[PDB]
Symmetry: D2
Subunit: 295 residues, 4 copies
């Protein structure tokens, strides 16, 4: 037998960083969870008890903190690229570094209508993420995403005209609730190295902002024919607004809210045009995916 | 043997309600999770297989949905009072109804700077809750709360002057991070019944808003001597602003962020005045509680 | 305003301990999560920024580890009593210690039919817990429990004869699934101090074993009229088998498994006597509670 | 723009099935969570609001329950193959079905030393899973796994000889705790269709049992040089025992248990040979992966 694939490293590394402007007093905080997994000429650690090839995961952890001390942690695309590049440059025998970063929200508080210099609120469990794959000889591949953006619209969602056969019980509808948790990923053009990533730094925050804005506005404004049709519109708009993106992927649960027929109780009318009280369904859920690229 | 205490009912009942203004087109959504547990002359269901005394939990579920259809679901203090009152009035042998409501956030989206008529975002996992105990002959006891309000300040927190003995390793500090998940509860004067609750309806939303505002502003502005000292200030302010409250309770974790000494690596300075990168600690955590009333 | 109640301390303290028999080579492991909250003459920490009265939560953490090093950690009733007693004896101004322990399962592996001397499996997420309240002048109050014991029986559960009115849709049944997560608590006679707790040490493991055995056998063998009727039988049996218990409490969710009518599809029969495929319901759930004592 | 990838279906479908032997009275229960996602000529649902190509996710749910009624649900490899095959055969335009099944444990209770005919315990949160990809023209690709198997050994784990440089603080050790949550996957030879899957049915349960047995025995008995070295031994043994497997993958967290130096307190010795009390670390964690195949 032989090792066909291997990677290893440190997961779930929580990291906070503060920036303090001593002139203005304004402080800014960043909090992440980081995973770094390495690949390379490490097979003998598995096959021969050869630990000499292992950069200890504890050392990978130390390196994450050191790198955060010595570099900006924002945008996460940049920090992940710096971190991944470090491992392939420092260790001859390491040939790929796979860096995942989850960024947690710390939004500055407004107190009495004024932004506070050092107090923050977790205003959403929504995350901003990156997956940065630094592969020796093959540059830097970056996937950026937003996830855990939970939304609901109470009308202007429809679902009719779907296939009907002997397995079908679902009624067509022209007016339903639509709710989802948005997971949206944009995949960047391959970058040749850290210089090229740095050269595009402003585009990372700008493209995240675009993706979020497009997601919310399209969700709110599209009189939706289906989750499929709405998510495609989001993706095509994001592609149109950043040429350095190659694809946009959405993964959307359809978090169902069922009508409750109450007509058995005193003829109460709570369906169709009279539907006011609904039963949110925890499970099961539709799950709708697509990846959109350019033609 | 004998039944010393008993209660039973339906937990984890998810409820959505929509209000539609047909004139303006503006829709407003509410989402809750409800628990109703009943007490009364039910001991024989336990001791003698006497199901005649059991209002089925399935029926309690139905009743929650019917009550939501026929009544406002806001403020939750009112809805819980209506719901609890129903059970003690409808069923002679039921003498208490214990209603817990967790309200989930659905905040109206702003799209292109304008509030959208039917689209919403879960802008925080923060909850607004009530515990409404309707006890026959003993009125309606209401505890209101906010929970899951997660905050951090990056300075203007201190902790020195604490007891030091042979069990103590903690260094005094004059400048640390403070982060918590706020759970704040205000306990209302007993209400005689549903008329008295209704007579105070505006005070419920107003007092929740006050509690939240005071919590945030005191957290942001207090140069904190301890979690104890800061939370007491919050409680005393809330009591001063609503005379129909009897007590305010806080339960606050101290979610520790540890400095990381990096001086072993190239003399890097990351402690004290040079501390920028910290290790958030998932566990353990301080847990600080108090209940404040009037003297 | 004034402090009506206060307690504080360290929560979520994970603790492992190993015992090594050097003669036999057999090792035995224990893993817990511990919370210790203190009460006493601490109000000035809240009202006056007086930290002198605070035994730091960090010190409470240290004390938990030191106490585990210097004492047995089993049975948890004993360890919690030692730990709580320490705080009220060491600190004049501390008058109560509230110790919660969750014990995690590490069951010794059997390999090739033989117990392994140092390898263990988390064979269930079931917990064994204690709540030990050491109150100066008022002895030691202990509540022991098992929780997270998840069970299902596929028949020999019934539910008929319940109240039927205009809120009722539930069909009577003479054959249904019953599934629950058992939370069972036994409350000990007050103990005067640590000598009296020690004098009863064997009874702690024995009573936990009895409670678990009775729970499982009664669940399996009772042709159940209701959750109420079955849980009462469990409680009365446990009381009969340990006179140093005063009460037994159960809290049981009714984790519903719904029939699925498939007769719309090719006349498939999947209800009543033909019911084979069911839809487990995540929510809502019945929740049934009682506390049984002696007459 | 154009659809580069798309799949959709129903996730989180909870399914229970009972088998009743009317002769013996013995009942046997199965509980799963199922996801089915479809691919095919569905792009127009995204690009043109063409719902005619969508088999509704609600219908996919119905189909899961119908298929469970009409077929065995065990082994899960077979059930998933039947279910996936159904969609590609029934719907001309559907060309792949991706079926994920998580099997939940319901282990028969032993009461008074005898197996009970209809009562079960969730004896572990360990899962048995399958991923069955039925792709038209490309047969049936099955990945089987066990996951959530949580283990600890208290000695006979070592970690020394790893790379040491300016990023390294970790001390070498010749005696440490090793704990992990095992996720082990075996990938089957491609099967041509449902006849070939059926022809190998006994091998599914047998290979799962082998994988579990090998995992536990190797973990317990290997005086481990590293997680890497131990997991490789597991994989090579499983490959040697089933020739219809092509690869075995492990993904193992290193769930760290740190020594606690207590020498600052009364010279207490709790490190090295005297280490008895440890601090389990919730995060971060090493994460070690490999895929082993034949040479
Ligand atoms: O039953 C369904 N209802 C749905 N709604 C939808 O927008 N698209 C689907 O394909 C669907 O996803 O959940 N299937
Ligand atoms: O070690 C401690 N550090 C703390 N900080 C604090 O504000 N109060 C405490 O009592 C303390 O709670 O966590 N104990
Ligand atoms: O609808 C109900 N079905 C139940 N079954 C039961 O055993 N007791 C109840 O009181 C009940 O609890 O869930 N209510
Ligand atoms: O610090 C480390 N300690 C480890 N132990 C191990 O078995 N292998 C590693 O590669 C290691 O994984 O966690 N890195």
């Amino acid at each position: 037998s032989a090792v066909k694939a291997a990677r290893y490293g440190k997961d779930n590394v929580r990291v906070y960083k503060v920036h303090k402007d001593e002139k203005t007093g304004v402080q800014t905080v960043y909090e992440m969870t980081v995973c770094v997994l390495l690949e390379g000429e490490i097979e003998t650690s598995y096959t021969k008890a050869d630990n000499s090839v292992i950069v200890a995961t504890d050392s990978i952890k130390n390196t994450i903190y050191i790198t955060a001390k010595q570099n900006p942690v924002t945008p996460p695309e940049l920090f992940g690229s710096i971190l991944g590049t470090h491992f392939i440059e420092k260790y001859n025998h390491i040939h790929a570094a796979h860096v995942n970063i989850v960024c947690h929200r710390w939004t500055r508080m407004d107190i009495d209508g004024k932004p506070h210099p050092h107090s923050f609120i977790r205003d959403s469990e929504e995350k901003r993420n990156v997956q940065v794959d630094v592969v020796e000889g093959k540059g830097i591949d970056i996937k950026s995403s937003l996830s855990g953006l939970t939304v609901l619209k109470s009308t202007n969602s429809q679902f009719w005209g779907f296939l009907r056969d002997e397995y079908t019980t679902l009624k067509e509808t022209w007016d339903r609730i639509l709710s989802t948790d948005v997971d949206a990923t944009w995949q960047w053009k391959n970058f040749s190295g850290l210089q090229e990533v740095r050269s595009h730094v402003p585009k990372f925050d700008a493209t995240w902002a675009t993706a979020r804005e497009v997601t919310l506005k399209t969700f709110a404004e599209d009189n939706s024919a289906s989750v499929q049709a709405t998510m495609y519109k989001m993706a095509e708009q994001i592609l149109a607004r950043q040429q350095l993106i190659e694809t946009v992927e959405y993964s959307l649960p359809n978090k169902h809210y069922f009508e409750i027929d109450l007509s058995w109780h005193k003829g109460l009318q709570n369906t169709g045009k009279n539907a006011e009280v609904f039963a949110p369904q925890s499970d099961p859920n539709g799950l709708i995916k697509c990846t959109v690229g350019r033609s």
